[PDB]
RNA sequence: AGGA
């Protein structure tokens, strides 16, 4: 659709690259966007400029590696560390296909609501999100906000860590004087840096005045200094100043440094361009720019984020750059990712990474020794028909299980402007291995959701307004991160999962799990369109037929089972040709009715 | 139409 195209002839002309998606809305070939390996994320979510910085903080090896690294720990307390774990690790599965972040979303804005860090933190986050049209400096002051909140998860997490800490850390000194020859100092370890409205080029300048600076000003004018002796592994930074002087860099010819070296000599800190023209001490580290999220002020004047990333290559010694809209994934220059004179690009959060710790490979979950234990036992959070597992019963990379899961509705389309929300209620997965303990379930679980729901679907669901956790129908009632990581981790292992619709229940509960783990009834019963009914299906090609009255997923779960069971019957010997359309010839001439 |  010349989509992919990220360059043009004019610097006011934006490339189509950096335009405006349409939204997903259902199928959706991905292919004409995305030619690479690396994945995308749905822009179908409230605060929509949070992708964009997902994006960067995925090819961060010390980064990834730590948040995945963290689930083979169950840590369901810390919810922003493990829900961007979920994620991290989903999107470096789907290898280009698409993902999406609802999960995070969903947990970002229930951390939110809690307000019931200062609070001016998630008292400007709730905002954003309920109302994408990118604001002033709101970006960045997402960026401080996701790192401390990381920080204070990670140090609550079983054997905690300090990992971040020692990537992200910068330890400030802040002095200031109270009185005439009396001096203030507090030590705080920020997690980023941040830019303000420096005096009188390159990016250089800019970083050493955030480092070591002198200001005036107080609830007296009292002067204040802070500074910086700590050189941190990934360096981020919150670049934002004004437009007067946003002007002035798209002048500067390369004012973006792709590598410089620098560190401490005096109390102060002072970086240069080569290796040589370094002076100082005995030891200096070498930075390379990691990838940074710029803003696009659009030709129809609105704004979204992108984000550039660079990517190191082990077999060939070379640097593979990447630029990130939604979904729209393309493979660009080193020339055309640093170039800041197009008058619509304004480099909004930088970061610098060390390095020989930049070319440190990407290493997944499956690396690691996870714990399966919660597979074993329940995790109910109220006090008050099936049997869970036994040690035995050990899951392997060709288990049978039989998924079917329900859930409400929170919103409403919301038209003008894409329909939002849909949000997990109930999950039952059944064991598909024959046996003594064949088509029985082990899990059974509800989630709980606190958030106003608009409509429970009971006809269709089949729930009752039992979700509010202790007030009622405390029946099997636990959260939403401790039902996904069962899910996640049958997907880890390689269980092929079997039901109706397969595809549509895990866009909502978020995770993507690969096709040859799949065996969708509505799939292989498929004949052109016309998609046939569960209960419509089972009342024609079994005997079992309860008129389809508040549907219950203990049940939806069973008999998708056993009607797979009746496609390998239909296909082991040669009769599912000649039957698929047999129930097609019944179904016309009965306008598919019971 | 399935899918809730």
């Known amino acids: 659709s010349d989509i992919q195209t990220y360059t043009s002839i004019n610097k006011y002309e934006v490339p189509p690259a950096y335009s405006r998606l349409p939204l997903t809305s259902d199928n959706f070939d991905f292919t004409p966007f995305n030619n690479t390996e690396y994945s995308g994320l749905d822009p179908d979510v409230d605060n929509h400029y949070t992708n964009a910085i997902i994006q960067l903080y995925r090819f961060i090896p010390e980064m990834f590696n730590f948040v995945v690294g963290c689930l083979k720990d ?27 972040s ?24 709730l905002e954003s999100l309920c109302i ?24 609550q997490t079983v054997n905690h860590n300090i990992t971040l800490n020692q990537c992200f850390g910068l330890e400030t000194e802040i002095r200031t004087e109270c009185s005439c020859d009396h001096y203030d100092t507090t030590v705080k370890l920020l997690p980023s840096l941040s830019i303000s409205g420096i005096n009188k080029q390159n990016i250089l300048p800019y970083i050493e005045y955030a480092m070591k600076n002198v200001t005036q000003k107080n609830s007296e004018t009292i002067t204040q200094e802070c500074t910086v002796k700590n050189l941190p592994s990934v360096l981020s930074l919150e670049l934002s100043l004004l437009d007067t002087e946003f002007s002035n860099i798209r002048s500067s010819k390369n004012w973006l440094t792709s590598e410089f070296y620098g560190s ?10 080569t290796a040589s023209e370094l002076k100082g001490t005995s030891h200096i580290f070498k930075y390379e720019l990691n990838g940074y999220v710029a803003k696009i002020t659009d030709n129809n004047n609105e704004t979204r984020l992108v984000t550039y990333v660079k ?4 077999k060939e010694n070379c640097f593979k750059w990447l630029m990130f809209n939604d979904y729209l994934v393309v493979e660009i220059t080193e020339e055309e990712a640093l170039k800041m004179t197009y008058p619509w690009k304004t480099p909004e959060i930088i970061i610098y990474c060390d390095a020989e710790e930049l070319r440190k490979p990407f290493f997944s979950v499956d690396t690691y020794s996870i714990n399966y234990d919660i597979l074993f036992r329940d995790y109910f959070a109220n006090g008050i028909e099936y049997k869970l597992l036994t040690h035995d019963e050990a899951p392997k990379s060709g288990t049978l299980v039989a998924i079917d899961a329900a859930f409400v509705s929170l919103q409403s389309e919301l038209c003008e402007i894409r329909p939002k929300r849909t949000a997990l209620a109930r999950i039952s ?13 082990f899990v059974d679980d509800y989630v709980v959701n606190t958030n106003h729901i ?3 679907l009971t006809r269709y669901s089949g729930i009752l307004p039992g979700d509010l956790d202790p007030e009622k129908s405390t029946k099997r ?13 049958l997907m880890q292992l390689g269980c092929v999962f079997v039901g109706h619709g397969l595809n549509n229940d895990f866009k909502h509960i978020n995770i993507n799990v690969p096709r040859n783990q799949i065996r969708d009834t509505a799939i292989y019963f498929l004949q052109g369109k016309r998609y046939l009914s569960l209960r419509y299906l089972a009342y024609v090609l079994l005997g079992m037929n309860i008129q389809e009255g508040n549907h219950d997923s203990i049940e939806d779960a069973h008999t998708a089972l056993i009607l797979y069971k009746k496609y390998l019957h239909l296909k082991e010997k040669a009769i599912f040709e000649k039957v698929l359309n047999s129930v097609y010839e019944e179904g016309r001439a009965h306008n598919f009715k019971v």
């Open 264 to 273: 401490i000599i005096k109390n102060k800190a002072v970086l240069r361009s």
């Open 454 to 456: 608009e409509d429970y």
């Open 477 to 489: 009632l636990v959260r939403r991160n401790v039902v996904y990581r069962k899910v996640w981790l």
């Open 102 to 125: 609802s999960n995070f979303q969903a947990s970002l804005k229930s951390l939110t609501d809690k307000r019931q860090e200062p609070q001016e933190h998630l008292e400007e986050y």
């Open 74 to 100: 169950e840590n369901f307390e810390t919810t922003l560390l493990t829900d961007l774990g979920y994620l991290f690790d989903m999107m470096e599965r789907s290898h280009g296909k698409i993902c999406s």
């Open 311 to 314: 990517k190191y290559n082990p």
């Open 132 to 155: 994408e049209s990118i604001k002033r400096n709101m970006p960045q002051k997402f960026n401080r906000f996701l790192l401390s909140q990381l920080i204070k998860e990670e140090a």
């Open 429 to 441: 997965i059944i064991r598909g291995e024959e046996g003594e303990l064949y088509g029985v379930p």
